[PDB]
Amino acid sequence: MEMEKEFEQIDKSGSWAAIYQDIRHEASDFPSRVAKLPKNKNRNRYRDVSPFDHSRIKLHQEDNDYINASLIKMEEAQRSYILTQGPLPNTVGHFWEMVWEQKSRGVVMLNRVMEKGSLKCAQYWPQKEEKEMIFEDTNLKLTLISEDIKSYYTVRQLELENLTTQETREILHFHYTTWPDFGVPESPASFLNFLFKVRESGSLSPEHGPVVVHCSAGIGRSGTFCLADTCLLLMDKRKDPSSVDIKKVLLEMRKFRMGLIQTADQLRFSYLAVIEGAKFIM
Ligand SMILES: CNC(=O)c1cc(Cl)ccn1
Ligand SMILES: CNC(=O)c1cc(Cl)ccn1
Numbered sequence: 001m002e003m004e005k006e007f008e009q010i011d012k013s014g015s016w017a018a019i020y021q022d023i024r025h026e027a028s029d030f031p032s033r034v035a036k037l038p039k040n041k042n043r044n045r046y047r048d049v050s051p052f053d054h055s056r057i058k059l060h061q062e063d064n065d066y067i068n069a070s071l072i073k074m075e076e077a078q079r080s081y082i083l084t085q086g087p088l089p090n091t092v093g094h095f096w097e098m099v100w101e102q103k104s105r106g107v108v109m110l111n112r113v114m115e116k117g118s119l120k121c122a123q124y125w126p127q128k129e130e131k132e133m134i135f136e137d138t139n140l141k142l143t144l145i146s147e148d149i150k151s152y153y154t155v156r157q158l159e160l161e162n163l164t165t166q167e168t169r170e171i172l173h174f175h176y177t178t179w180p181d182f183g184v185p186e187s188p189a190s191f192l193n194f195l196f197k198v199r200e201s202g203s204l205s206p207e208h209g210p211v212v213v214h215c216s217a218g219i220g221r222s223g224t225f226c227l228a229d230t231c232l233l234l235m236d237k238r239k240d241p242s243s244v245d246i247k248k249v250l251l252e253m254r255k256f257r258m259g260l261i262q263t264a265d266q267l268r269f270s271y272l273a274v275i276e277g278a279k280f281i282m
């Protein structure tokens with residue numbers, strides 16, 4: 001079926017939970033043996049969210065190459081994404097090592113450091129220009145260059161230096177700051193505006209490594225971001241845009257990381273975002 005009318009049919013019939021459970025039943029199951037090794041317990045935030053072995057990002061290190069991060073490669077859309085958990089106190093150096101080694105231009109953050117009175121990720125970037133951060137375990141230096149605070153999101157320019165080679169690179173930090181502590185946004189308008197700002201920066205384009213996107217577990221809000229981006233790109237590329245099937249795209253993405261889209265409300269919000277986005281594109 002088309003999307004917008006499939007949408008009203010699910011609303012009128014109140015069957016979002018049944019649609020979402022079907023997706024959960026059909027989703028791929030692949031091994032994640034490296035994630036579960038005892039030496040990696042303090043590298044995982046949640047015991048039930050792990051990268052598959054076949055798609056995990058490897059650190060260029062011979063001691064321990066493990067990080068909780070996955071490469072999502074969308075062949076028809078010609079887009080790749082790295083989805084990862086919010087960094088932990090003992091993985092902030094690994095996080096920036098990955099950004100460096102994978103040649104990423106942008107980092108997309110969809111959570112606040114504290115939500116619901118608890119810490120959802122480490123404070124992993126500097127908050128003042130004159131107070132830079134040094135990650136001694138991976139030999140990197142990170143400096144805040146500029147910051148632009150808007151009503152729904154903040155954009156930061158960061159300098160990442162590989163202290164071993166003295167090479168430097170400019171990284172863009174795109175921080176969506178207004179996702180509610182509970183539920184999903186009432187309108188997709190600010191989330192779509194944010195997606196378009198990431199696109200306009202070059203961070204999603206083939207001349208760079210894959211964008212790094214995270215929330216707390218790296219599957220819920222993060223899944224919503226890449227699912228909406230890929231569906232809108234396919235609607236632009238194909239002769240028949242009504243052939244784009246959001247449930248089929250989601251199942252393809254779940255071949256590369258488990259659990260993408262965590263609730264039926266997030267599924268409905270993803271439909272809403274793609275529907276409204278397709279009208280603005282033209
Ligand atoms: C759907 N996207 C494309 O077909 C495409 C084509 C090029 Cl050149 C770069 C990125 N994407
Ligand atoms: C060129 N701009 C867009 O294509 C766009 C699209 C959407 Cl959905 C929101 C904001 N900007």
Ligand SMILES: CNC(=O)c1cc(Cl)ccn1
Nearest residue numbers: 232235236241242278281
């Ligand atoms: C019916 N057309 C569409 O849905 C559409 C959607 C997009 Cl994103 C571009 C062009 N056409």
